[PDB]
Structure 1
Amino acid sequence: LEVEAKLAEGRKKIEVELQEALGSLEQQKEDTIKSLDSQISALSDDIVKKVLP
């Protein structure tokens, strides 16, 4: 009985911690893409001149 209740609770906890970690990785990834958007403005500057052979 004790392991049943506590393990239901434990698997619930594991899945909701999975969802929290997922949200955190999502927000971090989006921030990195925006910083990359600034870096890639610099990239857009330094590409078009060489793209023409």
Structure 2
Amino acid sequence: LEVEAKLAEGRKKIEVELQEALGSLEQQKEDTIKSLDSQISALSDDIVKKVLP
């Protein structure tokens, strides 16, 4: 009972840490994805040049 409850508490703490790390990574990814719209225009122009011969 002792080791099982201890490992369950540790697993809850690790789940909290995983939730926090995942929220951090997802927020940073969404921020950087909204960022850099100029490379999108540049790559769209490059795609125009690739398609149009």
Instruction: Select the structure that is richer in helix.
Output: 2
Quote how far apart the aligned CAs of 1:36 are.
Answer: 3.6
Partner of residue 16, structure 1: 16
Coordinate RMSD, CA, aligned: 1.9
Deviation per CA, 1:6-31, whole angstroms, max 9, x where unpaired? 22210000011111111011011111
| SS of match in other structure, 1:48 | helix
1:50 and 1:10 mapped to 2: Cα distance? 54
Larger deviation: 8-17 or 38-47?
38-47
Compute the TM-score of the two structures, normalised by the length of structure 2.
0.69
TM-score, scaled relative to structure 1 = 0.69
Unaligned runs of 5+ in 1: none
Deviation at 1:46, TM superposition (A): 4.1
Give identity over the alignment, percent.
100
Alignment of 1:33-48 (within 5 A): 33-48=33-48
Which structure 2 segments of 5+ residues have no match? none
